[PDB]
Amino acid sequence: EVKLILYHWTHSFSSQKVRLVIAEKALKCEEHDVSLPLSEHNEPWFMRLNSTGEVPVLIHGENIICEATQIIDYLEQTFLDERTPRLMPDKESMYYPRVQRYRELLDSLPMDAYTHGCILHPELTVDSMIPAYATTRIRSQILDHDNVKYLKKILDELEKVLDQVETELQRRNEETPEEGQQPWLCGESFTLADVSLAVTLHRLKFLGFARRNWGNGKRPNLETYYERVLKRKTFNKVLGHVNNILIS
Amino acid sequence: EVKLILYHWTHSFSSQKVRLVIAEKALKCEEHDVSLPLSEHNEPWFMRLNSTGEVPVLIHGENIICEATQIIDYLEQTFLDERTPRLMPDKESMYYPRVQRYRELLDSLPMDAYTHGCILHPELTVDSMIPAYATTRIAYIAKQKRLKSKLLDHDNVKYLKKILDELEKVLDQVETELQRRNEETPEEGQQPWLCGESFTLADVSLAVTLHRLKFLGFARRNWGNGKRPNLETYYERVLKRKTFNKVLGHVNNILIS
């Protein structure tokens, strides 16, 4: 009856979180990617990240909601049919402050700064998925992300956030018969904290910040978690290709 | 070939400014009024103004822009064909500062609070166009809550009266500005608008504001019967402007869904 309509850019980080929420709630949505394969200056998507500062927008009957967090909040409060998976516990549920604490913590990461740093200072990356020729174009023909010290700070701040997540995932291992059906970050169900986390890890991979932070024996619960979400059906269906620079 | 798409609510104040800008620039736009003739609780548009959910959105190719001021700024910067009227002076014009000053002065007015004030405290209006029944819809603890609600009302009236006096100060400045335009203009010839001869974004904001103040019942306090006669003449003129009448001619008419 009442259509759900989303306007968004496939490769915007905000939108990827919105789209995964929609799929995790199994909502039918008429999704419009308005990004173009090539810009005026014949640049592809990966040369145009965290440009503009615009936000995705949802239209649902009479309601118009801009910005990913507000759209996600609106979807959760609005689609309450019993068959619709909830992604937050009840507002007075035991764990509500835990899910929300992590969600805000991850949603606070300055991803826009990690990206321009990836390009401006590729020396701090490992196996960046952005071609080297972006470093030369977005520097020659062009706070300040240019502060290498700043980037090294927030990367250490990211280290702090992921220690917290790593601890929390060890807690899921102790508490659960570790054989059988494993839980997610905050408990048995996939939450809004999982979307923020899954999408964040995937963008860090894209930028070359996965190996500095996990792998090679570092943060093994996080490595395991990332590998799990990659095989999750909704994630793979919605975001499986979003790091692939061959796909417009 | 790259459509302009607008989603909006017809009777929302922000939407009206946007759609008048589009008409004044003669742009082709696919406009979606997403508002419903009747709500769940069988209320029509003029009982849902106390809504606090009205931000329009423009989609234009790869761009998504929310909120009236940002959308209007985008329209002005983007549509530069020589047939397309400009509604701001060039940034290096002697006139740019006066237009931008008035535009910001008008856009800073707290319109949502005037409308909530209109419904909560109709005694402070004269000839409000909202039916009175939109007001009526919106021993130990028996004395606690009585006193508490008494205090809230006292504070909100003090607030409403405060911003109503601030509206008078803004409109005094506007009256003086229109007095200058009148002094400068031969009584037979092309009458100017607020900031000069061209219709600008400051005129858009003034016109839609005046028309909404009329609807809420805050016009007779501020112009008419000898008060601010230049402002009254301006308002009567803008009601006759073709673009205004086409886009907004009926937006105060509660008979029209």
Author numbering:
A (entry chain B): 23 to 164, 197 to 302
B (entry chain A): 23 to 160, 184 to 302
Give passages from the manuscript.
The GDAP1‐linked CMT genotypes are mainly missense point mutations. Structural analysis of GDAP1 indicates that CMT may arise from disruption of specific intra‐ and intermolecular interaction networks, leading to alterations in GDAP1 structure and stability, and, eventually, insufficient motor and sensory neuron function.
Here, we describe the biochemical and structural properties of the Finnish founding CMT2K mutation H123R and CMT2K‐linked R120W, both of which are autosomal dominant mutations. The disease variant proteins retain close to normal structure and solution behavior, but both present a significant decrease in thermal stability.
